[PDB]
Amino acid sequence: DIPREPRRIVIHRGSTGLGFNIVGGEGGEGIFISFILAGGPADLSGELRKGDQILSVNGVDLRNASHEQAAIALKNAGQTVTIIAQYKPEEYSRFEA
Structure with missing residues (x-):
């Protein structure tokens, strides 16, 4: 069901945040979802x-952003958040395995 090209995904922040955690933002690695919380919004x-790369959070481009810049963008994105994601499990595994 997950396409190759970037996709738009709307999620609502709750008591456990957006329901995922991130890695990357250094060297050749962009911002990747490393963990999805069971029962959370994501x-x-x-x-x-x-293994999704986050390309944008609302209008904030994360393709050339450090980890802390991404975490701040996600924290400050509000209650309703539009994520542009692109699924790259092989690249994720190269950087994270």
């Missing part, structure tokens, strides 16, 4: 995966 969308 999981309930059914539309975000470990």
Whole structure:
């Protein structure tokens, strides 16, 4: 169900944040989802995966952003957050395995 090209995914922040954690933002590695919280917003969308690269959070481009810049952008993105994600599990595994 997950396409190759970037996709838009809307999620609502809750008491466990957006329901995922991130790695990367250094060297050749962009911002990747490393963990999806069971029952959290990202999981309930059914539309975000470990190994997704986050390209944008709302309008904030994360393609050339450090980890802390990405974490701040995600923290400050509000209650309703539109993530542009692109699924890159092989690249994720190269950097993280």
